[PDB]
GROMACS .gro file of C-alpha atoms in nm:
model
  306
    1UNK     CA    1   0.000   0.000   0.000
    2UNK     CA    2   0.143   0.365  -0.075
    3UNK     CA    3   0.117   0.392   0.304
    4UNK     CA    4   0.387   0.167   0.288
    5UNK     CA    5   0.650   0.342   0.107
    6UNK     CA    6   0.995   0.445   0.208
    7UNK     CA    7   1.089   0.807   0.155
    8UNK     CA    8   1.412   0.687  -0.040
    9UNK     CA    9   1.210   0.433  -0.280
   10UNK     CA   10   0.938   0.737  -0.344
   11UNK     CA   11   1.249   1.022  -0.402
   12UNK     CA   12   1.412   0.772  -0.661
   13UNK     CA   13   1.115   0.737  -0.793
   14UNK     CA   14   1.052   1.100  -0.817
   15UNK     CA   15   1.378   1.114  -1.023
   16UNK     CA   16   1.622   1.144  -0.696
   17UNK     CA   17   1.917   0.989  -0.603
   18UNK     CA   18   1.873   0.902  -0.227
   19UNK     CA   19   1.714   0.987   0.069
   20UNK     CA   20   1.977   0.886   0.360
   21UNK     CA   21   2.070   0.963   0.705
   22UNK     CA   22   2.385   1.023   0.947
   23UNK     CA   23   2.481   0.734   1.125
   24UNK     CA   24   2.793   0.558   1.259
   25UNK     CA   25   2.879   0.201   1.441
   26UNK     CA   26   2.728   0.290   1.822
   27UNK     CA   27   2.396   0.328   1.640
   28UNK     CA   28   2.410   0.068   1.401
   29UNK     CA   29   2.451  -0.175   1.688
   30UNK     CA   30   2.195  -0.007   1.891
   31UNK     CA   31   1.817   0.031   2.004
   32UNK     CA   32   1.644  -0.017   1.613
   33UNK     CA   33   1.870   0.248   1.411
   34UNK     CA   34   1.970  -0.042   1.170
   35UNK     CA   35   1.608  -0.237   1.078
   36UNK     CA   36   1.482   0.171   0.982
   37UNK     CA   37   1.802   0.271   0.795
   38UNK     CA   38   1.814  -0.048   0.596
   39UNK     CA   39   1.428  -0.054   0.521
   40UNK     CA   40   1.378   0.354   0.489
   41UNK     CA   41   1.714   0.532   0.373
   42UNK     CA   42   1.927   0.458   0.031
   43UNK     CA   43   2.243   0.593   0.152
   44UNK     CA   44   2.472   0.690   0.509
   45UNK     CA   45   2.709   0.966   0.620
   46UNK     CA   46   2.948   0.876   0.901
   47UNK     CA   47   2.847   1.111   1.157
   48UNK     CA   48   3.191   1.109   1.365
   49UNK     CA   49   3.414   0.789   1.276
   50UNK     CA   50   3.559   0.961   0.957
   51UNK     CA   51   3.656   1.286   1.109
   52UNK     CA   52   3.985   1.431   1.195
   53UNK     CA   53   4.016   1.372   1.545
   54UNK     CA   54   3.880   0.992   1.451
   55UNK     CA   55   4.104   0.917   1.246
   56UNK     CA   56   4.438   1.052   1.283
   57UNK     CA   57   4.496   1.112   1.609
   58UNK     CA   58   4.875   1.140   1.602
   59UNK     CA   59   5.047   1.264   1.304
   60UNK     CA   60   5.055   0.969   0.990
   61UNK     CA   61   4.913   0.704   1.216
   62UNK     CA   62   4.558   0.683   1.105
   63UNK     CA   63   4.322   0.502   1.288
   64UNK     CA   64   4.009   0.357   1.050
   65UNK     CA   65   3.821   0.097   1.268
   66UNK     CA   66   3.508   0.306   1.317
   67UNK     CA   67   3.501   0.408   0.951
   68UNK     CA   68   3.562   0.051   0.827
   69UNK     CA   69   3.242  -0.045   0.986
   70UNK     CA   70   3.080   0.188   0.887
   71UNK     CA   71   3.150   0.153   0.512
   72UNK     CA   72   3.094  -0.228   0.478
   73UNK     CA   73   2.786  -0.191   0.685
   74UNK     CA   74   2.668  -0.009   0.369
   75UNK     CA   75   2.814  -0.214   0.122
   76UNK     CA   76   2.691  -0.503   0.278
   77UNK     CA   77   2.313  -0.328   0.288
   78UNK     CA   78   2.321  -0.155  -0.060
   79UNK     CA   79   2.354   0.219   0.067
   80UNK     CA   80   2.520   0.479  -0.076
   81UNK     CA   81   2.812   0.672   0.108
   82UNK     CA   82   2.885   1.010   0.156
   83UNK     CA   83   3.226   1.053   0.319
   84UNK     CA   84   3.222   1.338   0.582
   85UNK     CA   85   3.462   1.551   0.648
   86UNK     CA   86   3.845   1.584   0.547
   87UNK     CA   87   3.932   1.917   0.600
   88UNK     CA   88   3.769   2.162   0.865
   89UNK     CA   89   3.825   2.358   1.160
   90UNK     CA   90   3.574   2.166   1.432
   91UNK     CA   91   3.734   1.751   1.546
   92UNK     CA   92   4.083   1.869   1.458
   93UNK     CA   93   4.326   1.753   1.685
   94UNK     CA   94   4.508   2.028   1.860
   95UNK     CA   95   4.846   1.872   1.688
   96UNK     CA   96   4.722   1.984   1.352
   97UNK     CA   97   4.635   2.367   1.503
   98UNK     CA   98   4.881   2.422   1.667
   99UNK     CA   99   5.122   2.390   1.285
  100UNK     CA  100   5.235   2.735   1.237
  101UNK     CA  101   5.409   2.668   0.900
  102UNK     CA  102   5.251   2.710   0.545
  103UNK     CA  103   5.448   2.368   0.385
  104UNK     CA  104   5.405   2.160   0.659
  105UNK     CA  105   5.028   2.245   0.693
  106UNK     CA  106   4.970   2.196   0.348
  107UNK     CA  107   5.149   1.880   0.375
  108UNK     CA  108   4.985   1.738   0.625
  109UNK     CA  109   4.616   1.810   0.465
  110UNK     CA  110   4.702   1.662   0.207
  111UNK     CA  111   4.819   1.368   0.354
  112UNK     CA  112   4.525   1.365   0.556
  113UNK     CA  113   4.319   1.366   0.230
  114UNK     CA  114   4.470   1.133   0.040
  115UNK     CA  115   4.497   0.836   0.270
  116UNK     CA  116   4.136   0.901   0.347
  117UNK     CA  117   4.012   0.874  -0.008
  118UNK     CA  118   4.251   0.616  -0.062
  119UNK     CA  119   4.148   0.376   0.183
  120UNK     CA  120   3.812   0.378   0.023
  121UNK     CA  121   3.876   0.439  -0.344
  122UNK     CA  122   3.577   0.355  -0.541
  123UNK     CA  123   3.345   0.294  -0.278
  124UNK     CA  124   3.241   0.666  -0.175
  125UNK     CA  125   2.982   0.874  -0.383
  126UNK     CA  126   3.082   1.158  -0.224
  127UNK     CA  127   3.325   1.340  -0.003
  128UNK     CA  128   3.271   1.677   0.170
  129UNK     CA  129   3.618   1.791   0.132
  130UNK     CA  130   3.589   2.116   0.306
  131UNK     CA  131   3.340   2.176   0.602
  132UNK     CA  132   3.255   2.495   0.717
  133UNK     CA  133   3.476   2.717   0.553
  134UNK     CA  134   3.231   3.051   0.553
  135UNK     CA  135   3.206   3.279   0.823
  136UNK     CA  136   2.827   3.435   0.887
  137UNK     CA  137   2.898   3.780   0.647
  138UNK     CA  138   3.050   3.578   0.374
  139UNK     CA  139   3.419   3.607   0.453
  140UNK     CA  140   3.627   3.276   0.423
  141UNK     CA  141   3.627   3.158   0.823
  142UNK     CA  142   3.948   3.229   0.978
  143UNK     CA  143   4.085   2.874   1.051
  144UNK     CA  144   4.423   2.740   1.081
  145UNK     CA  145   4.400   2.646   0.719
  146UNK     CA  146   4.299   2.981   0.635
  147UNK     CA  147   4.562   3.140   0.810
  148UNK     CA  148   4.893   2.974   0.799
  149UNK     CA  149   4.813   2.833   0.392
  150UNK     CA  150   4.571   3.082   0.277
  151UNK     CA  151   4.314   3.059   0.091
  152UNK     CA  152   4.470   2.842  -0.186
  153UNK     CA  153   4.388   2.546   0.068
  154UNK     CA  154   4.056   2.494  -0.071
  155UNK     CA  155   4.152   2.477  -0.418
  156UNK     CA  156   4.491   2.282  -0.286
  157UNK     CA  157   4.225   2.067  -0.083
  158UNK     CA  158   3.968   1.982  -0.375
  159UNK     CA  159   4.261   1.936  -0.644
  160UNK     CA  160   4.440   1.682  -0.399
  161UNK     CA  161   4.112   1.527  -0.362
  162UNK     CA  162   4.033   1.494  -0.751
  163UNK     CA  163   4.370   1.291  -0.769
  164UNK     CA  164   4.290   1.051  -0.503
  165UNK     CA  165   3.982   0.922  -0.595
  166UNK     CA  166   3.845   1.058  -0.895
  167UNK     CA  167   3.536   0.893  -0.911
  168UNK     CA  168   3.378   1.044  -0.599
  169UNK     CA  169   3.190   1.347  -0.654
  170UNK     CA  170   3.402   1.656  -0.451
  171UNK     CA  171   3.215   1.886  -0.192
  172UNK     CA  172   3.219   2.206  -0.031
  173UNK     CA  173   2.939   2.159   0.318
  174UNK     CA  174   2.812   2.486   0.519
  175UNK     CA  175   2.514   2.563   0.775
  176UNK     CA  176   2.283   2.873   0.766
  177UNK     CA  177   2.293   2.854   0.357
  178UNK     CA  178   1.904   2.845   0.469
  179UNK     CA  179   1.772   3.199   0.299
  180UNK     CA  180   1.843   3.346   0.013
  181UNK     CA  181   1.930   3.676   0.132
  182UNK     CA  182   2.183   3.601   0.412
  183UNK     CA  183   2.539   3.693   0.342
  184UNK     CA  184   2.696   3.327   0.358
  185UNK     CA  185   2.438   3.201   0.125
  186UNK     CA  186   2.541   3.442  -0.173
  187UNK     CA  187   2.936   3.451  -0.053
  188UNK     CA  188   2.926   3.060  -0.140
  189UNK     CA  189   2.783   3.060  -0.466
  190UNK     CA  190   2.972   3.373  -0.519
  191UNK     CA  191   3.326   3.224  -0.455
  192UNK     CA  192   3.261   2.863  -0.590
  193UNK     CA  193   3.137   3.011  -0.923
  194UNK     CA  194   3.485   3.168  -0.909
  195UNK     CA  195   3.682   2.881  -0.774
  196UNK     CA  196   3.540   2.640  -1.047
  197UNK     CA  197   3.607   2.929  -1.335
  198UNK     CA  198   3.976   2.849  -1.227
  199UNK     CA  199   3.949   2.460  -1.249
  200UNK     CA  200   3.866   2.383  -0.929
  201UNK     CA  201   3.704   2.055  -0.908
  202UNK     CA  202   3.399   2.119  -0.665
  203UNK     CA  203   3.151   1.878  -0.806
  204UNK     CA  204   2.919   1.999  -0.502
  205UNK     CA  205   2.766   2.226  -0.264
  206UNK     CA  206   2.648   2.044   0.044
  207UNK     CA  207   2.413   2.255   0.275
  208UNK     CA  208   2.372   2.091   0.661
  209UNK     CA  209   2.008   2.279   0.637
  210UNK     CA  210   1.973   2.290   1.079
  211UNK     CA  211   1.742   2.447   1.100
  212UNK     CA  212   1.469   2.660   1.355
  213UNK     CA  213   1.081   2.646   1.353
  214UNK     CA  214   0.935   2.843   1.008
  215UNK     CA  215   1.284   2.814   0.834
  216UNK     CA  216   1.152   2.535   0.583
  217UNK     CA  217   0.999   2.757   0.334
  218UNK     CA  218   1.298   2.968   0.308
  219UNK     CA  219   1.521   2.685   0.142
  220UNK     CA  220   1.244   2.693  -0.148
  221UNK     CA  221   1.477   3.003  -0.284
  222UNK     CA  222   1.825   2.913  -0.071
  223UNK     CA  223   1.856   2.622  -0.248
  224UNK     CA  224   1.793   2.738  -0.612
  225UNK     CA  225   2.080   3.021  -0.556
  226UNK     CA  226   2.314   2.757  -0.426
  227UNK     CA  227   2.278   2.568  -0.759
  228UNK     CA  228   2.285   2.882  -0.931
  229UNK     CA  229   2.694   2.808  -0.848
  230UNK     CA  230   2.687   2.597  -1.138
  231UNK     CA  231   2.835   2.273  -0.949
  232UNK     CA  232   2.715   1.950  -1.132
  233UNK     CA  233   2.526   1.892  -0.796
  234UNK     CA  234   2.399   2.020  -0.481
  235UNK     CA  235   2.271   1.829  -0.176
  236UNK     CA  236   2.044   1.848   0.137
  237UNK     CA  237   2.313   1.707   0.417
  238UNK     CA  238   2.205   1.742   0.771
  239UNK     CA  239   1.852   1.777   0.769
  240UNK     CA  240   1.671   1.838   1.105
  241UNK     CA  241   1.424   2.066   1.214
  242UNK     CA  242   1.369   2.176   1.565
  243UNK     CA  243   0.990   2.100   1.633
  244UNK     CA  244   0.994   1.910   1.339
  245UNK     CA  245   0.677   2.081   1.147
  246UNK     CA  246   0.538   1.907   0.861
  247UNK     CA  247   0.540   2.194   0.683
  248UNK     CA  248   0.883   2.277   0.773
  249UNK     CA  249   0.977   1.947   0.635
  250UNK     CA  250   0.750   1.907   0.315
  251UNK     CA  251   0.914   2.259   0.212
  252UNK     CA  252   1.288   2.116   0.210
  253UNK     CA  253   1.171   1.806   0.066
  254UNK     CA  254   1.008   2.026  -0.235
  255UNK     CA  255   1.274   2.251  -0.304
  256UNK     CA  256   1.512   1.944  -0.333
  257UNK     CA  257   1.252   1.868  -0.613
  258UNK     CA  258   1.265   2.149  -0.785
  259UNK     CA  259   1.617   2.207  -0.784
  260UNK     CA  260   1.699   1.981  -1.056
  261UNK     CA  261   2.116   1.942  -0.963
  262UNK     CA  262   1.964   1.848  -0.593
  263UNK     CA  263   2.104   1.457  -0.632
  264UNK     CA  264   1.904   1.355  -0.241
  265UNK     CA  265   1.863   1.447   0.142
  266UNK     CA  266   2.055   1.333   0.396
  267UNK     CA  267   1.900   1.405   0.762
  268UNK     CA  268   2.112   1.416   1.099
  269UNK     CA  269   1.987   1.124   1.258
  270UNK     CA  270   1.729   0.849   1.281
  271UNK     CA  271   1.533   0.900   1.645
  272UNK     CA  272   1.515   1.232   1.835
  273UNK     CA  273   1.709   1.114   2.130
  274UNK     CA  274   2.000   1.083   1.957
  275UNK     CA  275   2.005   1.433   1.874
  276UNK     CA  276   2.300   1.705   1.854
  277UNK     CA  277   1.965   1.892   2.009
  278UNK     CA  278   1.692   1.612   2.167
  279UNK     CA  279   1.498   1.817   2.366
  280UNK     CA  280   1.359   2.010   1.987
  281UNK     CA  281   1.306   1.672   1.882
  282UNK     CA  282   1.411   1.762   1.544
  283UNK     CA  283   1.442   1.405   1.355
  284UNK     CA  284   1.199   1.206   1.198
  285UNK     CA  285   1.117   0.936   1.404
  286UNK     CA  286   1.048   0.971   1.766
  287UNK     CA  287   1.203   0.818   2.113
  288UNK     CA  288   1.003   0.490   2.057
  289UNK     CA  289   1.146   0.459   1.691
  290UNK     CA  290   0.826   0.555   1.562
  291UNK     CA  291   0.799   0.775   1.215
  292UNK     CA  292   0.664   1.083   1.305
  293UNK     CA  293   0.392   1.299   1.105
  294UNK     CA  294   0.662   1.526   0.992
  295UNK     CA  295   0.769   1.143   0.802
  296UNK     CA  296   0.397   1.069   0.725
  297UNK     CA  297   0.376   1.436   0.551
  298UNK     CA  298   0.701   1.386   0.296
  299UNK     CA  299   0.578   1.051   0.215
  300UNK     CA  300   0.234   1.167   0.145
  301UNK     CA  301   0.411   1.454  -0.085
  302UNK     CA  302   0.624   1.260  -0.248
  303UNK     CA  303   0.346   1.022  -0.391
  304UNK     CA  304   0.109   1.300  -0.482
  305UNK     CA  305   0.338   1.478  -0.628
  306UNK     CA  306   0.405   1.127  -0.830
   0.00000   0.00000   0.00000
Protein backbone atom coordinates (compact mmCIF):
# COMPACT_ATOMS: atom_id res chain seq x y z
CA UNK A 1 0.00 0.00 0.00
CA UNK A 2 1.43 3.65 -0.75
CA UNK A 3 1.17 3.92 3.04
CA UNK A 4 3.87 1.67 2.88
CA UNK A 5 6.50 3.42 1.07
CA UNK A 6 9.95 4.45 2.08
CA UNK A 7 10.89 8.07 1.55
CA UNK A 8 14.12 6.87 -0.40
CA UNK A 9 12.10 4.33 -2.80
CA UNK A 10 9.38 7.37 -3.44
CA UNK A 11 12.49 10.22 -4.02
CA UNK A 12 14.12 7.72 -6.61
CA UNK A 13 11.15 7.37 -7.93
CA UNK A 14 10.52 11.00 -8.17
CA UNK A 15 13.78 11.14 -10.23
CA UNK A 16 16.22 11.44 -6.96
CA UNK A 17 19.17 9.89 -6.03
CA UNK A 18 18.73 9.02 -2.27
CA UNK A 19 17.14 9.87 0.69
CA UNK A 20 19.77 8.86 3.60
CA UNK A 21 20.70 9.63 7.05
CA UNK A 22 23.85 10.23 9.47
CA UNK A 23 24.81 7.34 11.25
CA UNK A 24 27.93 5.58 12.59
CA UNK A 25 28.79 2.01 14.41
CA UNK A 26 27.28 2.90 18.22
CA UNK A 27 23.96 3.28 16.40
CA UNK A 28 24.10 0.68 14.01
CA UNK A 29 24.51 -1.75 16.88
CA UNK A 30 21.95 -0.07 18.91
CA UNK A 31 18.17 0.31 20.04
CA UNK A 32 16.44 -0.17 16.13
CA UNK A 33 18.70 2.48 14.11
CA UNK A 34 19.70 -0.42 11.70
CA UNK A 35 16.08 -2.37 10.78
CA UNK A 36 14.82 1.71 9.82
CA UNK A 37 18.02 2.71 7.95
CA UNK A 38 18.14 -0.48 5.96
CA UNK A 39 14.28 -0.54 5.21
CA UNK A 40 13.78 3.54 4.89
CA UNK A 41 17.14 5.32 3.73
CA UNK A 42 19.27 4.58 0.31
CA UNK A 43 22.43 5.93 1.52
CA UNK A 44 24.72 6.90 5.09
CA UNK A 45 27.09 9.66 6.20
CA UNK A 46 29.48 8.76 9.01
CA UNK A 47 28.47 11.11 11.57
CA UNK A 48 31.91 11.09 13.65
CA UNK A 49 34.14 7.89 12.76
CA UNK A 50 35.59 9.61 9.57
CA UNK A 51 36.56 12.86 11.09
CA UNK A 52 39.85 14.31 11.95
CA UNK A 53 40.16 13.72 15.45
CA UNK A 54 38.80 9.92 14.51
CA UNK A 55 41.04 9.17 12.46
CA UNK A 56 44.38 10.52 12.83
CA UNK A 57 44.96 11.12 16.09
CA UNK A 58 48.75 11.40 16.02
CA UNK A 59 50.47 12.64 13.04
CA UNK A 60 50.55 9.69 9.90
CA UNK A 61 49.13 7.04 12.16
CA UNK A 62 45.58 6.83 11.05
CA UNK A 63 43.22 5.02 12.88
CA UNK A 64 40.09 3.57 10.50
CA UNK A 65 38.21 0.97 12.68
CA UNK A 66 35.08 3.06 13.17
CA UNK A 67 35.01 4.08 9.51
CA UNK A 68 35.62 0.51 8.27
CA UNK A 69 32.42 -0.45 9.86
CA UNK A 70 30.80 1.88 8.87
CA UNK A 71 31.50 1.53 5.12
CA UNK A 72 30.94 -2.28 4.78
CA UNK A 73 27.86 -1.91 6.85
CA UNK A 74 26.68 -0.09 3.69
CA UNK A 75 28.14 -2.14 1.22
CA UNK A 76 26.91 -5.03 2.78
CA UNK A 77 23.13 -3.28 2.88
CA UNK A 78 23.21 -1.55 -0.60
CA UNK A 79 23.54 2.19 0.67
CA UNK A 80 25.20 4.79 -0.76
CA UNK A 81 28.12 6.72 1.08
CA UNK A 82 28.85 10.10 1.56
CA UNK A 83 32.26 10.53 3.19
CA UNK A 84 32.22 13.38 5.82
CA UNK A 85 34.62 15.51 6.48
CA UNK A 86 38.45 15.84 5.47
CA UNK A 87 39.32 19.17 6.00
CA UNK A 88 37.69 21.62 8.65
CA UNK A 89 38.25 23.58 11.60
CA UNK A 90 35.74 21.66 14.32
CA UNK A 91 37.34 17.51 15.46
CA UNK A 92 40.83 18.69 14.58
CA UNK A 93 43.26 17.53 16.85
CA UNK A 94 45.08 20.28 18.60
CA UNK A 95 48.46 18.72 16.88
CA UNK A 96 47.22 19.84 13.52
CA UNK A 97 46.35 23.67 15.03
CA UNK A 98 48.81 24.22 16.67
CA UNK A 99 51.22 23.90 12.85
CA UNK A 100 52.35 27.35 12.37
CA UNK A 101 54.09 26.68 9.00
CA UNK A 102 52.51 27.10 5.45
CA UNK A 103 54.48 23.68 3.85
CA UNK A 104 54.05 21.60 6.59
CA UNK A 105 50.28 22.45 6.93
CA UNK A 106 49.70 21.96 3.48
CA UNK A 107 51.49 18.80 3.75
CA UNK A 108 49.85 17.38 6.25
CA UNK A 109 46.16 18.10 4.65
CA UNK A 110 47.02 16.62 2.07
CA UNK A 111 48.19 13.68 3.54
CA UNK A 112 45.25 13.65 5.56
CA UNK A 113 43.19 13.66 2.30
CA UNK A 114 44.70 11.33 0.40
CA UNK A 115 44.97 8.36 2.70
CA UNK A 116 41.36 9.01 3.47
CA UNK A 117 40.12 8.74 -0.08
CA UNK A 118 42.51 6.16 -0.62
CA UNK A 119 41.48 3.76 1.83
CA UNK A 120 38.12 3.78 0.23
CA UNK A 121 38.76 4.39 -3.44
CA UNK A 122 35.77 3.55 -5.41
CA UNK A 123 33.45 2.94 -2.78
CA UNK A 124 32.41 6.66 -1.75
CA UNK A 125 29.82 8.74 -3.83
CA UNK A 126 30.82 11.58 -2.24
CA UNK A 127 33.25 13.40 -0.03
CA UNK A 128 32.71 16.77 1.70
CA UNK A 129 36.18 17.91 1.32
CA UNK A 130 35.89 21.16 3.06
CA UNK A 131 33.40 21.76 6.02
CA UNK A 132 32.55 24.95 7.17
CA UNK A 133 34.76 27.17 5.53
CA UNK A 134 32.31 30.51 5.53
CA UNK A 135 32.06 32.79 8.23
CA UNK A 136 28.27 34.35 8.87
CA UNK A 137 28.98 37.80 6.47
CA UNK A 138 30.50 35.78 3.74
CA UNK A 139 34.19 36.07 4.53
CA UNK A 140 36.27 32.76 4.23
CA UNK A 141 36.27 31.58 8.23
CA UNK A 142 39.48 32.29 9.78
CA UNK A 143 40.85 28.74 10.51
CA UNK A 144 44.23 27.40 10.81
CA UNK A 145 44.00 26.46 7.19
CA UNK A 146 42.99 29.81 6.35
CA UNK A 147 45.62 31.40 8.10
CA UNK A 148 48.93 29.74 7.99
CA UNK A 149 48.13 28.33 3.92
CA UNK A 150 45.71 30.82 2.77
CA UNK A 151 43.14 30.59 0.91
CA UNK A 152 44.70 28.42 -1.86
CA UNK A 153 43.88 25.46 0.68
CA UNK A 154 40.56 24.94 -0.71
CA UNK A 155 41.52 24.77 -4.18
CA UNK A 156 44.91 22.82 -2.86
CA UNK A 157 42.25 20.67 -0.83
CA UNK A 158 39.68 19.82 -3.75
CA UNK A 159 42.61 19.36 -6.44
CA UNK A 160 44.40 16.82 -3.99
CA UNK A 161 41.12 15.27 -3.62
CA UNK A 162 40.33 14.94 -7.51
CA UNK A 163 43.70 12.91 -7.69
CA UNK A 164 42.90 10.51 -5.03
CA UNK A 165 39.82 9.22 -5.95
CA UNK A 166 38.45 10.58 -8.95
CA UNK A 167 35.36 8.93 -9.11
CA UNK A 168 33.78 10.44 -5.99
CA UNK A 169 31.90 13.47 -6.54
CA UNK A 170 34.02 16.56 -4.51
CA UNK A 171 32.15 18.86 -1.92
CA UNK A 172 32.19 22.06 -0.31
CA UNK A 173 29.39 21.59 3.18
CA UNK A 174 28.12 24.86 5.19
CA UNK A 175 25.14 25.63 7.75
CA UNK A 176 22.83 28.73 7.66
CA UNK A 177 22.93 28.54 3.57
CA UNK A 178 19.04 28.45 4.69
CA UNK A 179 17.72 31.99 2.99
CA UNK A 180 18.43 33.46 0.13
CA UNK A 181 19.30 36.76 1.32
CA UNK A 182 21.83 36.01 4.12
CA UNK A 183 25.39 36.93 3.42
CA UNK A 184 26.96 33.27 3.58
CA UNK A 185 24.38 32.01 1.25
CA UNK A 186 25.41 34.42 -1.73
CA UNK A 187 29.36 34.51 -0.53
CA UNK A 188 29.26 30.60 -1.40
CA UNK A 189 27.83 30.60 -4.66
CA UNK A 190 29.72 33.73 -5.19
CA UNK A 191 33.26 32.24 -4.55
CA UNK A 192 32.61 28.63 -5.90
CA UNK A 193 31.37 30.11 -9.23
CA UNK A 194 34.85 31.68 -9.09
CA UNK A 195 36.82 28.81 -7.74
CA UNK A 196 35.40 26.40 -10.47
CA UNK A 197 36.07 29.29 -13.35
CA UNK A 198 39.76 28.49 -12.27
CA UNK A 199 39.49 24.60 -12.49
CA UNK A 200 38.66 23.83 -9.29
CA UNK A 201 37.04 20.55 -9.08
CA UNK A 202 33.99 21.19 -6.65
CA UNK A 203 31.51 18.78 -8.06
CA UNK A 204 29.19 19.99 -5.02
CA UNK A 205 27.66 22.26 -2.64
CA UNK A 206 26.48 20.44 0.44
CA UNK A 207 24.13 22.55 2.75
CA UNK A 208 23.72 20.91 6.61
CA UNK A 209 20.08 22.79 6.37
CA UNK A 210 19.73 22.90 10.79
CA UNK A 211 17.42 24.47 11.00
CA UNK A 212 14.69 26.60 13.55
CA UNK A 213 10.81 26.46 13.53
CA UNK A 214 9.35 28.43 10.08
CA UNK A 215 12.84 28.14 8.34
CA UNK A 216 11.52 25.35 5.83
CA UNK A 217 9.99 27.57 3.34
CA UNK A 218 12.98 29.68 3.08
CA UNK A 219 15.21 26.85 1.42
CA UNK A 220 12.44 26.93 -1.48
CA UNK A 221 14.77 30.03 -2.84
CA UNK A 222 18.25 29.13 -0.71
CA UNK A 223 18.56 26.22 -2.48
CA UNK A 224 17.93 27.38 -6.12
CA UNK A 225 20.80 30.21 -5.56
CA UNK A 226 23.14 27.57 -4.26
CA UNK A 227 22.78 25.68 -7.59
CA UNK A 228 22.85 28.82 -9.31
CA UNK A 229 26.94 28.08 -8.48
CA UNK A 230 26.87 25.97 -11.38
CA UNK A 231 28.35 22.73 -9.49
CA UNK A 232 27.15 19.50 -11.32
CA UNK A 233 25.26 18.92 -7.96
CA UNK A 234 23.99 20.20 -4.81
CA UNK A 235 22.71 18.29 -1.76
CA UNK A 236 20.44 18.48 1.37
CA UNK A 237 23.13 17.07 4.17
CA UNK A 238 22.05 17.42 7.71
CA UNK A 239 18.52 17.77 7.69
CA UNK A 240 16.71 18.38 11.05
CA UNK A 241 14.24 20.66 12.14
CA UNK A 242 13.69 21.76 15.65
CA UNK A 243 9.90 21.00 16.33
CA UNK A 244 9.94 19.10 13.39
CA UNK A 245 6.77 20.81 11.47
CA UNK A 246 5.38 19.07 8.61
CA UNK A 247 5.40 21.94 6.83
CA UNK A 248 8.83 22.77 7.73
CA UNK A 249 9.77 19.47 6.35
CA UNK A 250 7.50 19.07 3.15
CA UNK A 251 9.14 22.59 2.12
CA UNK A 252 12.88 21.16 2.10
CA UNK A 253 11.71 18.06 0.66
CA UNK A 254 10.08 20.26 -2.35
CA UNK A 255 12.74 22.51 -3.04
CA UNK A 256 15.12 19.44 -3.33
CA UNK A 257 12.52 18.68 -6.13
CA UNK A 258 12.65 21.49 -7.85
CA UNK A 259 16.17 22.07 -7.84
CA UNK A 260 16.99 19.81 -10.56
CA UNK A 261 21.16 19.42 -9.63
CA UNK A 262 19.64 18.48 -5.93
CA UNK A 263 21.04 14.57 -6.32
CA UNK A 264 19.04 13.55 -2.41
CA UNK A 265 18.63 14.47 1.42
CA UNK A 266 20.55 13.33 3.96
CA UNK A 267 19.00 14.05 7.62
CA UNK A 268 21.12 14.16 10.99
CA UNK A 269 19.87 11.24 12.58
CA UNK A 270 17.29 8.49 12.81
CA UNK A 271 15.33 9.00 16.45
CA UNK A 272 15.15 12.32 18.35
CA UNK A 273 17.09 11.14 21.30
CA UNK A 274 20.00 10.83 19.57
CA UNK A 275 20.05 14.33 18.74
CA UNK A 276 23.00 17.05 18.54
CA UNK A 277 19.65 18.92 20.09
CA UNK A 278 16.92 16.12 21.67
CA UNK A 279 14.98 18.17 23.66
CA UNK A 280 13.59 20.10 19.87
CA UNK A 281 13.06 16.72 18.82
CA UNK A 282 14.11 17.62 15.44
CA UNK A 283 14.42 14.05 13.55
CA UNK A 284 11.99 12.06 11.98
CA UNK A 285 11.17 9.36 14.04
CA UNK A 286 10.48 9.71 17.66
CA UNK A 287 12.03 8.18 21.13
CA UNK A 288 10.03 4.90 20.57
CA UNK A 289 11.46 4.59 16.91
CA UNK A 290 8.26 5.55 15.62
CA UNK A 291 7.99 7.75 12.15
CA UNK A 292 6.64 10.83 13.05
CA UNK A 293 3.92 12.99 11.05
CA UNK A 294 6.62 15.26 9.92
CA UNK A 295 7.69 11.43 8.02
CA UNK A 296 3.97 10.69 7.25
CA UNK A 297 3.76 14.36 5.51
CA UNK A 298 7.01 13.86 2.96
CA UNK A 299 5.78 10.51 2.15
CA UNK A 300 2.34 11.67 1.45
CA UNK A 301 4.11 14.54 -0.85
CA UNK A 302 6.24 12.60 -2.48
CA UNK A 303 3.46 10.22 -3.91
CA UNK A 304 1.09 13.00 -4.82
CA UNK A 305 3.38 14.78 -6.28
CA UNK A 306 4.05 11.27 -8.30
Amino acid sequence: AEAAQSVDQLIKARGKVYFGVMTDQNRLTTGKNAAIIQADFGQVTPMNSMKWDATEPSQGNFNFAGADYLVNWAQQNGKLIRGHTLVGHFYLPSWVSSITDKNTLTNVMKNHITTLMTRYKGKIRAWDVVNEAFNEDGSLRQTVFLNVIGEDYIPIAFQTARAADPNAKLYINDYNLDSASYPKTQAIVNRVKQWRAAGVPIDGIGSQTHLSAGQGAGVLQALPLLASAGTPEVAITELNVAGASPTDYVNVVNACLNVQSCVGITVAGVADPDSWRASTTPLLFDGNFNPKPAYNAIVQDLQQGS
